[PDB]
Amino acid sequence: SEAVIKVISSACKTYCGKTSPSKKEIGAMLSLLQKEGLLMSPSDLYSPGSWDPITAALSQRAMILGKSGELKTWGLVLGALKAAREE
Ligand SMILES: O=P(O)(O)O[C@H]1[C@H](O)[C@@H](OP(=O)(O)O)[C@H](O)[C@@H](OP(=O)(O)O)[C@H]1O
């Protein structure tokens, strides 16, 4: 939607620095996860136990369809969030 997007933005800008996903990339991945049935809300990313199925599903789609466009964004989020939850 909006609020959660900016939250993710400022978050990754602190963990990944300048090498963070652009807002235009964040929204794209967000909408994909919803239509894929992987997620249902923008706050779903706050669930660590739901990361595994997503990474698996995206990896499958990437290696089968031949495109890691959505996987790249996920990897960036996963890395930053994993580090955040590590503290
Ligand atoms: O303020 P930053 O540390 O430079 O991060 C920005 C902000 O999060 C911005 O939201 P806002 O315009 O509300 O500050 C967003 O739109 C940008 O993504 P993009 O470059 O594709 O336009 C992003 O880099």
Contact 2, 42 (CB under 8 A): no
Contact 55, 74 (CB under 8 A): yes
- Counting atoms of ligand 1 from 1, which one is nearest the CA of 9? 8
Q: Which of 9, 76, 77 to mutate to test the pocket of ligand 1 (most atoms within 8 A of CB)?
A: 9
Structure tokens at 50: 């739901």
Domain chopping of the chain, boundaries: 1-87
b or e along 52-61 (b: 16 or more beta carbons within 10 Å of the residue's beta carbon)?
A: eebeebbeeb
b or e along 12-41 (b: 16 or more beta carbons within 10 Å of the residue's beta carbon)?
A: beebeeeebbeeebbbebbebbeeeeebee
Contact 76, 21 (CB under 8 A): yes
- Dihedral through CA 62, CA 66, CA 22, CA 80, nearest 10? 30
Technique behind the model: NMR
CA of 18 to the centre of ligand 1 (A): 11
